[PDB]
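assembly run, all chains below
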Amino acid sequence: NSKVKKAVIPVAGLGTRMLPATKAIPKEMLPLVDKPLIQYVVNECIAAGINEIVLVTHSSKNSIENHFDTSFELEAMLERQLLEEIQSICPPHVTIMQVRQGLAKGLGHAVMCAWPVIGNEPVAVILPDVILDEYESDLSKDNLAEMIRRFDETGHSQIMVEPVADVTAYGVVDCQGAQLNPGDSAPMVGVVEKPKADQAPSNLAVVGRYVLSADIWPLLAKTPIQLTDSIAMLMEKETVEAYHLKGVSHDCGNKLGYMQAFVEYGVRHETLGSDFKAWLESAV
Amino acid sequence: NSKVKKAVIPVAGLGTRMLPATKAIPKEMLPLVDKPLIQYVVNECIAAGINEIVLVTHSSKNSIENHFDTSFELEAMLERQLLEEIQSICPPHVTIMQVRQGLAKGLGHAVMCAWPVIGNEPVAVILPDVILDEYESDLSKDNLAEMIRRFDETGHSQIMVEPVADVTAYGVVDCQGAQLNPGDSAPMVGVVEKPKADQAPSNLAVVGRYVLSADIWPLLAKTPEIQLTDSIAMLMEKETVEAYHLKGVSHDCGNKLGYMQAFVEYGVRHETLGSDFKAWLESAV
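ok done. output:
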């Protein structure tokens, strides 16, 4: 077993890039075909062997929690496989926990809110608008799953990265020139936010998945809170590696990424994929 | 002016065909690209000249009302165009009203709940999971708009219909043989639910838009759950009830495929993202 027993999911942000759809609903509940973003992400954690999930949330996001809880009126209304399917959304051995975020305070702070739940233990941190494509990787072996096994072997933190066209647009890691392929981990030495062309130490951009040793918690005391800055302070104390994304991710935190993903999952849907796929080809 | 001053929108149903996405959100708030279903439908009413909208709703659907109300924290957050754009979602001259439905009781009952708001006046009834395509019609004078002006001319009820992608799947009107083109209205004599092939009096299926004279209200105090069509039948006995041919196209976003199809079709027409999406599409298949 891993000492990484819980995953933090900061879901407290209002989704201003996905307006007006998110005016009165959480960006985490936008459907990707017929399931909300947050359900794929909780499934990914489950597949990586994490059974305990800590949402850091906002007052207007109750619906995220209702989605995994028992929906009483709905169940009563059902009198098929449908009942069973919605009764399976959260497996009984999986537990969702919730703590509210204080002010509109950034990601490092979001994670800081989850400390009293976790304690001084390593921790998985998961950005809920990035979706790791379950058809192009095996999430029970690759990506988060792999980063946890790597963390258990070495005790080094793991920051997921993927190559990007434009290095000035994301946060970008410094691996001292390192050779890096899908599925590999190698030491990183720094992180810069939206670097200028000449400042970028690489094109490997942070994807939004972190496995952090219990060391970050004391470091999360000091201000920049942004996570990366606190990560930097750990790189000074201890070895922090970067892990190359396997398969594909979809950034569903921008409109186009979300419309792209909807279609891609739309084609793979396992009762409606073929009709949709056909319809598409004829209509395009 | 029309005496049809208000539109009824039954939004109290739990959306069991769109599960699990609708487990904890209203089927009316599923986004079509970047706006929820209900926002297109309210806009359609607005364009037809209706400034007063009556939602018949359920306890778990507050978010529908929040979507058109002021969202206070969000606005404070903003601080450009975005603020203005979300401040425009409901025009100041438009008013949303809400009443809760009693039991899980059907469509005819939903409309009954809206009677104390409206009174003995004609009424527009609008099914919120059918979306009338705004690019293929002009909604300010086709479809609902046209049915209202027709209703003012003649005082005949108007039941929107379109030739179908079946026939056994829908409710189908009897127009005594008549040919009927997009935009026309003609008398109908009956309605049958999911007829067998050999039973169908036509292939013109009810779309989910109704302009009803104040006559339905007394008739709605009688049973077939409680269903609208049956009550409409009782009016056809008493008075002239016409069928109006849909102009342009509709999307049935009450089934998964119809919704995935619509998402793509509106995806390609989106104002700022249509071309990137369209290109991305063509390259990706």
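Chain B touches chain A through 47 residues (CB under 8 Å).

Residues 256-269 of chain B form the longest helix (14 residues).

not gonna interpret more than that til we talk
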